[PDB]
Amino acid sequence: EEIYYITFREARMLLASRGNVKLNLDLRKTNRVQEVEIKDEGAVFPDGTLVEREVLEKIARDDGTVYFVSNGGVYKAAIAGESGFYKLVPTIPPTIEINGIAMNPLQDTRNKVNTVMPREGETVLDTCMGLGYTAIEASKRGAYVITIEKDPNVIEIARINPWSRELFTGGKIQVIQGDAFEVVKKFKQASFDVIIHDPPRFSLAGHLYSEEFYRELFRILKPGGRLFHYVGKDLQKGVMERLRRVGFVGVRRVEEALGVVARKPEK
Ligand code: NA
Ligand code: NA
Ligand code: NA
Numbered sequence: 001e002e003i004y005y006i007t008f009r010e011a012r013m014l015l016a017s018r019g020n021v022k023l024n025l026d027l028r029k030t031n032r033v034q035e036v037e038i039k040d041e042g043a044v045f046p047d048g049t050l051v052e053r054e055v056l057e058k059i060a061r062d063d064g065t066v067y068f069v070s071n072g073g074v075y076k077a078a079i080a081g082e083s084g085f086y087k088l089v090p091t092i093p094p095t096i097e098i099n100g101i102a103m104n105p106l107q108d109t110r111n112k113v114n115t116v117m118p119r120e121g122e123t124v125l126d127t128c129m130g131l132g133y134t135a136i137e138a139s140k141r142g143a144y145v146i147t148i149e150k151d152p153n154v155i156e157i158a159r160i161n162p163w164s165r166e167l168f169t170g171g172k173i174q175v176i177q178g179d180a181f182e183v184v185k186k187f188k189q190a191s192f193d194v195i196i197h198d199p200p201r202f203s204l205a206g207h208l209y210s211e212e213f214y215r216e217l218f219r220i221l222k223p224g225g226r227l228f229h230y231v232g233k234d235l236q237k238g239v240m241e242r243l244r245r246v247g248f249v250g251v252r253r254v255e256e257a258l259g260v261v262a263r264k265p266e267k
């Protein structure tokens with residue numbers, strides 16, 4: 001029934017600890033710890049499954065993947081599909097690896113969402129899900145979030161990540177699978193109070209930096225609507241330039257969040 005998430009951190013703990021220990025089994029999502037009694041042949045979890053020393057040693061040495069204990073057995077939070085191999089990586093919080101792809105982390109997503117300050121009663125567009133962390137943070141403020149994910153395997157990996165749970169627990173957030181450049185075309189004009197645009201790097205996602213795309217972002221924003229465009233330069237240049245060309249105003253760097261904000265006029 002319950003899933004116990006375990007990474008190298010927990011396995012090392014259990015191989016080197018004695019008797020019984022209190023450990024966190026949802027990847028620090030909920031701060032709660034549970035007792036796992038240690039035996040010679042392995043560790044038995046709060047469900048009664050014994051993960052044998054063999055398994056814990058294996059995962060104690062593999063610090064590059066998340067594991068979980070579901071029903072009878074232990075499992076690896078990964079998926080083989082199409083031409084890529086995706087896996088959840090035991091960072092805090094977890095990150096996704098697609099064959100091989102990318103206080104620091106969770107503050108960074110709060111800095112991003114802080115640029116546009118989504119409020120209760122507002123609708124936000126998050127153009128590139130990833131694991132959903134920006135979409136979730138924007139929804140925890142009270143806004144209704146639409147978030148686009150191109151890769152159905154990213155969505156499936158998000159599904160077993162306890163940190164992406166709010167993408168799927170009812171509503172507050174709605175997940176569109178598809179191509180963001182094409183999806184935004186089928187959005188109605190003046191739909192969104194804020195847009196958070198966090199695309200892949202220029203060289204791999206040039207069309208998400210195009211005037212054509214920015215015009216679509218412009219069209220679908222409400223008057224007075226807010227845009228954050230991540231940048232992470234010479235492209236910041238064009239981004240700022242192309243956003244004004246398209247209609248945006250208040251276009252400026254936000255240094256903390258490594259991006260550009262903009263505001264659609266005619267409030
Ligand atoms: Na496996
Ligand atoms: Na507001
Ligand atoms: Na995003």
Ligand code: NA
Nearest residue numbers: 130132133134
């Ligand atoms: Na995200």
Ligand code: NA
Nearest residue numbers: 133134136137
């Ligand atoms: Na989040």
Ligand code: NA
Nearest residue numbers: 179180181182
């Ligand atoms: Na796209």
